[PDB]
Amino acid sequence: EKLIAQSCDYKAAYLGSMLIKELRGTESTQDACAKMRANCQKSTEQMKKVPTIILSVSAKGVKFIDATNKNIIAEHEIRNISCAAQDPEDLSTFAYITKDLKSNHHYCHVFTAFDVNLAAEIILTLGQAFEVAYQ
């Protein structure tokens, strides 16, 4: 139940959970990311800095725990995740879509990593997990 090599645990930053009415694929994630990242700043530089959350992703499920208050935000099966995308120009920002059953909608959960490889790894780990769980 440790899955030291079967799961990855990183410190991400919870940017936002954007509610999507109709899921149009990566468009929704790209839209949320671009719109919000630009809304998060002005004529300023990369002021894209949000609260840290421990992004733990496993082939059996993904769990989001707060890094400050260790708040058990949510633990959802990887089978509940539908797709995982990232920002077209910012590979340090990842946004994945889930099937939020209690919402009857799809929330684009976008987090900003503190490292490109870190974010890219999460994307790959999510994709691989969903891919292997698909079959």
UniProtKB/Swiss-Prot annotation:
Location in or out of the cell: Cytoplasm
Coiled-coil boundaries: none
Induction, per UniProt: Transcriptionally up-regulated in t(1:19) pre-B cell acute lymphocytic leukemia by the chimeric TCF3-PBX1. Not expressed in pre-B cell that lack this translocation.
Domain PID: 4-135
Domain of life, per lineage: Eukaryota
Tissue localization of expression: Highly expressed in marrow from patients with pre-B ALL associated with the t(1;19) translocation. Strongly expressed in brain and testis. Expressed in fetal brain. Isoform 4 is highly expressed in brain (at protein level). Isoform 6 is expressed in brain and several cancer cell lines.
Complexes and interactors: Isoform 3 interacts with DLG4. Interacts with EPHA8. Isoform 2 interacts with COIL. Isoform 4 interacts with APP and EPHA8. Isoform 6 interacts with EPHA8.
Function: Isoform 2 may participate in the regulation of nucleoplasmic coilin protein interactions in neuronal and transformed cells. Isoform 3 can regulate global protein synthesis by altering nucleolar numbers.
UniProt name for this protein: Ankyrin repeat and sterile alpha motif domain-containing protein 1B
Organism: Homo sapiens
Gene: ANKS1B
Residues of the full protein shown: 1053 to 1187 of 1248
